[model samples]
Target: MQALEKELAQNEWELQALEKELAQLEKELQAWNCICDIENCSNMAPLYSDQALKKKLAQLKWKLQALKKKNAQLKKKLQA
Candidate 1:
């Protein structure tokens, strides 16, 4: 039982770390999205070039997707 308990604790920690990363990534993506939205709507000098912003957005989205996939796999692992 001790070994099983230890394993469970490790997994719990892993889940916590993953959740933290997910939250951070989500916040970052939201901020970037907001910037893009504002830039698109107004004529103010853009902080980032449109092409660069789009590229960054695409990369962020890809990363978020990968993280979500990993999160799902971890949840499934815990359930099993």
Candidate 2:
């Protein structure tokens, strides 16, 4: 039973790590989406010009959303 509980704890830690990573990716998307991809309008836009950032931002946003949903589900399970 101790080993089983240890495995469960390890899995929980792994889930938390994944959630942290999800937040990191979301933070980057906030910068890229809310700032980087803007025209000369966004305050941060003047820093650079590369359409690749736009594409990368879109992909990351999608991935982050999926991860967030999974994280929420895990949290719900823990509560139950």
lDDT for each candidate structure: 0.54, 0.52
Q: How many backbone clashes does candidate 1 have?
A: 0
Worst 10 residues of 1 by lDDT: 2-11
Question: Model 1: per-residue lDDT, tens digit, 1-80?
Answer: 44544454554454455455545546555546753454246666656565675666576566547645644554455465
List TM-scores for all candidates, in order: 0.34, 0.33
* Candidate 2 per-residue C-alpha lDDT over 8-59 given as tens digits, one digit per residue, 9 for 90 to 100: 4555555455545555656654545863454454445443334665565566
Q: How accurate is candidate 2 locally (lDDT)?
A: 0.52
User: Which has the greatest TM-score?
Assistant: 1
Clashes of 2: 0
- lDDT value, residue 65 of candidate 2: 73
